[PDB]
Amino acid sequence: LRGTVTDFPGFDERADAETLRKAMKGLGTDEESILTLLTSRSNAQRQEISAAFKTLFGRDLLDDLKSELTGKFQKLIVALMKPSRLYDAYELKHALKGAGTNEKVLTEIIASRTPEELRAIKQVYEEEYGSSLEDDVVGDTSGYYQRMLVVLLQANRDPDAGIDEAQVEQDAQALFQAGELKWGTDEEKFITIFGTRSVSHLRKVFDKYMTISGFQIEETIDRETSGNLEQLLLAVVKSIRSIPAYLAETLYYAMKGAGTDDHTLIRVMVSRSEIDLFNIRKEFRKNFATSLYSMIKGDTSGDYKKALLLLC
């Protein structure tokens, strides 16, 4: 896992505070200055620039960036400024909050994050927002989608140790028979297989599944659309195989067709900039025969594409 953003060598929080102050101060705004500085500092350095900005000027850097900037560019800079430890929990709170629910952010983050990451997300969510992530998810979702989400939210998959092939055989069968009935009959049985087994066990299951049916499990669950639970099952199957591959694909489908899902583009670009965006880049090129760069550049404009291309 290699990230695309790294600590800037020779950082001076005070110098960077003053540069940012100068870019904003007075009539107008110098976005080029802001943009090139904040995509080359790490998230933790940005936090030190904010601290230093308030000691020197008594102003809040994020409110100033929200006042001075506009549109998708403002959305991206505000996302970059969010402390890394708060961001997935923030995005989770905003998919739940209000009327309806953005199931896409819920599935994405709960299926692509590791048990370590989730233990930490549930802790910072509680701290920050006062309610349990579990109680807000249950407050907002229904049926087996809710159940599988809660199962994944316990952050208790089995450990990667004994490949119990008897259990590999049995679970492969169970999934096969669940596959043919289009993931609509024994939901309890497969929610436990998909949510509770080790990543190594399930990889061996997905293989034996293929030898039993001739094809890949995502083919049967595939309706890359329609039905919350199917969409989650597909996000889990793809993340068991490769989280950088699954994230590269949501990125791809954020730009394919008319429009752009700029919210997903900003969310995956920002949240993974210092975790695995390099690996996601590799996966993108290899699976889609285009680089992430080229697609971003075709699908985005202005200061917002300059900043994205610098984070890519």
Shortest Å distance, C-beta 258 to Ca ion? 6
**Cα distances (angstroms) measured from residue 11 to each of 42, 78, 258:** 10, 21, 41
Shortest Å distance, C-beta 95 to Ca ion? 8
Quote the DSSP letter at residue 311: T
Shortest Å distance, C-beta 187 to Ca ion? 23
158, 201 Cβ separation under 8 angstroms: yes
Q: Which residues contact 109 (CB under 8 A, 6 or more apart)?
A: 88, 91, 92, 121
277, 4 Cβ separation under 8 angstroms: yes
At 291 the three-state DSSP class reads coil
Nearer to Ca ion, 220 or 260 (CB): 260
The first and second tokens of residue 47, run together, are: 């936090």
At 241, the amino acid letter reads R
Nearer to Ca ion, 29 or 167 (CB): 29
Nearer to Ca ion, 95 or 234 (CB): 95
Shortest Å distance, C-beta 286 to Ca ion? 21
Nearer to Ca ion, 74 or 177 (CB): 74
Nearer to Ca ion, 249 or 299 (CB): 299
Q: Which residues contact 305 (CB under 8 A, 6 or more apart)?
A: 296, 297
Q: Please state, in angstroms and rounded to a whole number, the distance separating the CA atoms of residues 23 and 30.
A: 5
Q: Which run of H or E residues covers position 105?
A: helix 103-112
> How would you class 47 by CB atoms within 10 Å of its CB: exposed for 0-12, middle for 13-18, buried for 19 or more?
middle
Shortest Å distance, C-beta 176 to Ca ion? 36
Give the residues lining the site for Ca ion (CB under 5 A): 24, 29, 69-70, 101, 140, 255, 260, 299
Nearer to Ca ion, 94 or 182 (CB): 94
Nearer to Ca ion, 102 or 154 (CB): 102
Shortest Å distance, C-beta 265 to Ca ion? 10
Q: Please state, in angstroms and rounded to a whole number, the distance separating the CA atoms of residues 10 and 63.
A: 26
The first and second tokens of residue 216, run together, are: 């890949």
Shortest Å distance, C-beta 158 to Ca ion? 32
